[PDB]
Amino acid sequence: QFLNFSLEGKVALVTGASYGIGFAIASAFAEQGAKVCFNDINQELVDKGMAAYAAKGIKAHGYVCDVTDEPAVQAMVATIAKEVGTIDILVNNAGIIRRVPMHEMDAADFRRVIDIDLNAPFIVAKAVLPAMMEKRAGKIINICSMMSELGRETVSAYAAAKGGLKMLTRNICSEYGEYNIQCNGIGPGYIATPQTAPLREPRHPFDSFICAKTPAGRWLDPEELTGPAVFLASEASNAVNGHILYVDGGILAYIGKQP
């Protein structure tokens, strides 16, 4: 039981898992025997998701829910509690990136990013904790970034959020760890998504720059995050708590490749 990475009979909710990282994590959760749920912002994105989960032989329970709407989240959770069962594994994947110079950035924009990337993980975690606290078992995996440690130009708001989510992780660990709730975090490095496929075509200055910073000397395929994700959702990581598990391929440990 100290080495069981099985998620057999565990209810899982991965927010924003219609595609991308969240999808890969939810797919792998199903593969480990978890009853998978997910949500997105509109019906179109849910239907696309449901189709892809079906396409791998997965009965995903999709929901149209805005994570910044607390009443709507509260409902979504009670619906999953009714239909599927009380949530055991929360993965706050849902989030948005915005590239705007900070001095030029609208106050409305900044707030949006914080609301979805920071406050929402609060709201969703708040909803699923009463369930977990009763049964004295739970997992809450917040998807942080490398921006939880490092800043860059334009991504000011996004970093502020992810750095805040990092502490939110540590605080949910602090407060609810006694109920045998493990709240950890996953910090993806440079992930090779379909959107970034152009940047790996013919010696590209960007791909060269990334493979320099990365000791592993490559981009990380999203599925690389699934192993870690399962691990933090498993009963093997019950002693891991308040921890940000960076899956970067060595970047945060490396000063860089220098001529």
Interface with ligand NAD (CB under 6 A), residue from 4, 43, 193, 208: 193
Sole binder of ligand NAD in the list 68, 86, 154, 180 (CB under 6 A): 68
Q: Which stretch binds ligand NAD (CB under 6 A): 93-101, 172-180, 233-241, 246-254?
A: 93-101
- State the binding string over 80-119 for a second copy (x if CB under 8 A, else -): ---------------------xxx-x-x--xx--xx--xx
* Per-residue tokens: 84: 């599927």
Q: What's the burial of 75, exposed, middle or buried (CB within 10 Å: 0-12/13-18/19+)?
A: middle
Catalytic residue among 158, 176, 190, 246: 158
The reply to whether 153 sits near a second copy by the rule CB under 8 A is yes
Min separation Cβ 217 and ligand NAD, Å: 17
Member of 46, 50, 67, 113 binding ligand NAD (CB under 6 A): 67
22 interacts with ligand NAD by CB under 6 A = yes
Q: How far apart are the C-alpha atoms of 29 and 13, rounded to whole Å?
A: 10
Query: Which of the listed partners (a second copy, ligand NAD, none) does 159 bind, with a CB threshold of 5 to 8 Å by partner kind?
Result: a second copy
- Active site (annotated) includes residue 246: no
Handedness of CA 188, 153, 98, 123 (dihedral sign): positive
| Beta bridge partners of residue 90, listed in sequence order | 13, 140
What is the separation of C-alpha 7 from the centre of its chain, rounded to a whole number of angstroms? 17
CA–CA distances in Å: residue 193 to residues 3, 80, 116, 171: 31, 30, 21, 31
Q: How many helices (H) and strands (E) does the chain have?
A: 8, 7
Instruction: Please give the residue ranges that form the binding site for ligand NAD (CB under 6 A).
Output: 15-16, 18-22, 39-41, 45, 66-68, 93-97, 116, 143, 145, 188, 191, 193
Residues involved in catalysis:
158
